[PDB]
């Protein structure tokens, strides 16, 4: 019996785990290992709903041959597990056990993968877990059903810029744009006087809350142009909220007799918009068409990277911000000490007494760590310790490398200075 | 006749700009300028009812006395503007142009300022521009009320982190908390089997939320330490959906009797918790409790320090993060330039030919180069074509201190 599988395993450690002998059992089969491959995956905050939206992709697909594939009214909501609650229930990334085959208008069968995910945000998780969950999902899924609630936001923008960006850094160069399909899919849109339920609803909201204009801030124009420039196809759908039951009640288990029938009839609208045979596009990769046992081989890939390889890995911004101004100020500190010594024991320089060098060196050295505790800089003096560590260290480095210079300038100083004396 | 007074102004420039007649006209009134002051804001995401919430904090303030403050049923929602649709209405911040005087149960008469924000991350806005807004109301207020929709998740938090740090960077050094109380309000809380509707369920689902176990990665524990070292008091409430009618009514117009009995029956509470005299925490900045006339001054010298660049402005996570990591890739093929090169011409080497020392420059120099364009950073060349050049430059400044040292070798 069809059931989810976990593919992906994120470990408490927060290491990441592909599990090859599942994932081969399903997307090796002799049956598909060969058939080109459509993934349809669904990414986005935690506790947002994407596993119920799933659930109802799996009906679609199960029941497209029947007048009634939205079931009986009275039928429970099954398939990757999901449930109310605050805290996160799907982890990882995790696949539904078989595999749809479907006709093409064109010809011949083609393969269909749904893949449910771990929602990014929760408080188990890092910044680089929820990165590394979102990114291999879009990595390999041709069609990214990114989830919502009830707005786009700029926030969102970034977040979805950031993890494409992770992805994108693990992907092979090409100079076609990198991912395919992208859906803004929004929870609860609460304006439809304003902007209709639907794709065109959503289509107009969208064209608008993406424009890129030259005119904008460059921090506006800069995340548009980047999820434009990642993307072949971006669309969005406004849906309803499903009403209070759906939202509150612990007793709801998915029975459409207890959803908003506005909901449900959007809801009928989406999934064979997302889903139908025409709008299924095969994955492609490096401008390759991929089959259900090549895209195990780019899923270890990507693993691989994400395990292996020096990746500018995910920071919160004050965490990103504070380490940029602390380099910063390290930087200008240890230029000015440094352009001060070069004033005073540079090459064209004359010798210097040890002594009357050290003295120099010391003062010059305060000065520059003076400069380093003025400059006003995020994470406060406690995040940079260890920057102004690094300082003190890498200028004693350079006076060490002065005193090398400064002594050849007089080899003889000691030994003349001994045989005077006497 | 009252009303809603714009108080910092947010030009589309991204400048910001203070009313100044508009907040002595308020503040340095006889009636209340040597009064401590108790200062209450409500800020947070954009679109989440944070001025119908303040409105009905309105309702409160001016009717304290009666058992039926929350008004009559068929009365609409005035006060700050607020409405549905998509686009923002409130930008930079607002407060309530009449003072109220009350009488804490210590004999202590207060007055207490209302404050609303310009909600964050609206699509006009840099992130510099929701951090200030976040950032003053904060650092103004006694009260911050954190107005959050449905869940308490971990970008909130590190929001909240950016936004209270950027805060205490423009305020004096202290040796106190930088702040007082703040209100995690849940807005739309779906969960009361699991915790309940109210101030207790919000406790214990905070106290959750919030806590620093040793078991946590270092970045979790690192949030929740900011936080919780940022605010003398920190307090959570969740409140349930108001309807949906609240929320998709283009008619709607804040009237009672069409919005959910238990959302007025939490509100009802809510209210006063946030805001009955003994609840009222007057404004202390670095020690010192704060009159309207002190209030006002600190208003104008905060904007002061955000109108002007002495400050560290923050980023974007991409473009943050694209920049540690150019700035990190430059210092590695500098060091890398700079160690090969001394053991080439340090102190304690022999004088190479000139024209050999400049072919060692130039081919270390353009492994350096290499190495800088083969590290991984966000995003693109593009935004690395200033580091690169600017690594080549300084590269260009050793060279040129190497050959004083090694010309002074050959001194003889
Ligand atoms: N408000 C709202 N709730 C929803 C919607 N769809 C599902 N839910 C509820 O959201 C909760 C979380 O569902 P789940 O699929 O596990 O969320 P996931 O964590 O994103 O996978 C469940 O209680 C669902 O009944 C929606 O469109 N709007
Ligand atoms: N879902 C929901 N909507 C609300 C709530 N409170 C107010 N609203 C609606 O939110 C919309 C925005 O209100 P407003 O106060 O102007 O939002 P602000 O931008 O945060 O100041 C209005 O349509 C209100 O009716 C709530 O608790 N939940
Ligand atoms: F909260 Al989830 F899948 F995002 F259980
Ligand atoms: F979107 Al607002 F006040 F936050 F109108
Ligand atoms: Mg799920
Ligand atoms: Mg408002």
Known sequence: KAGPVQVLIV????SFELDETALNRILLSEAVRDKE??????????????????????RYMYNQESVDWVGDYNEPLTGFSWRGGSERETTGIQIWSEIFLINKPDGKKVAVLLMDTQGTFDSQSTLRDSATVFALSTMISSIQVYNLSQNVQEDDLQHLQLFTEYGRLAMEETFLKPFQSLIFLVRDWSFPYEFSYGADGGAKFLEKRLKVSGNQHEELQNVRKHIHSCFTN??????????????????????????????????????????????????????NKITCRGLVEYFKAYIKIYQGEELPHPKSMLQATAEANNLAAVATAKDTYNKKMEEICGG??????????????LQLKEESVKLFRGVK?????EF??????????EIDELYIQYIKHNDSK???HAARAAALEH
């Open 377 to 381: 800089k995020m994470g406060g003096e």
């Open 410 to 412: 007089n080899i003889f």
């Open 11 to 14: 470990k408490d450690d927060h």
């Open 384 to 393: 940079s310790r260890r920057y102004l560590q690094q300082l003190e260290s």
């Open 37 to 58: 491959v459509v993934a349809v995956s669904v990414a986005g905050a935690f506790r947002k709903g994407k596993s119920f939206l799933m659930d109802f992709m799996l």
């Open 348 to 361: 064209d320089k004359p010798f210097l007494a040890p002594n009357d060098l050290q003295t120099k060196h």
């Open 234 to 287: 971006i669309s969005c759908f406004l849906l309803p909220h499903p009403g209070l039951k759906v939202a509150t009640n612990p007793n709801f288990d998915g029975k459409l007799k207890e959803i908003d029938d506005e909901f449900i009839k959007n809801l009928k609208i989406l999934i064979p918009w997302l889903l139908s045979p025409e709008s299924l596009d095969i994955k492609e990769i490096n401008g």
